[PDB]
Amino acid sequence: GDAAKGEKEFNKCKTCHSIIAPDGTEIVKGAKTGPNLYGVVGRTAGTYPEFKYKDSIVALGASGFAWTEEDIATYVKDPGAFLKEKLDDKKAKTGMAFKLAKGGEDVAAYLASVVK
């Protein structure tokens, strides 16, 4: 995907999220309302350190759910619904009170590029 467009598009992502360098330097000085996305790619979702997740997203992760580029790209288009679906649960609420039926694709590539 267009990692460059992903980077630009990240202007929205960072409203809640951020991206951190391996050493801890706050590269994307965004918010920390959502789990800092650096290294989301391949991660077992709800398990990033120092982040107050919910039961749903954590359980999804615990069920052996890993964030692929595809999954990430899809998620942003239908968060909450994604959880509800894959967890086969009704009460699978998400903190992400935001959706976007675009960006996901390029942003996923950007995240994949960023995990260095």
Ligand code: HEC
């Ligand atoms: C503010 C509201 C936003 C915006 C604009 C975006 N996200 Fe995203 N996000 C947000 C919260 C509060 C949470 C936590 C969910 C929970 O219930 O705990 C999330 C979570 C994610 C995740 C999950 C990652 C993980 O499991 O560790 C992904 C993936 C994710 N959000 C990605 C993402 C992208 C690519 C965005 C770009 C526009 C984006 N979010 C925006 C809150 C918010």
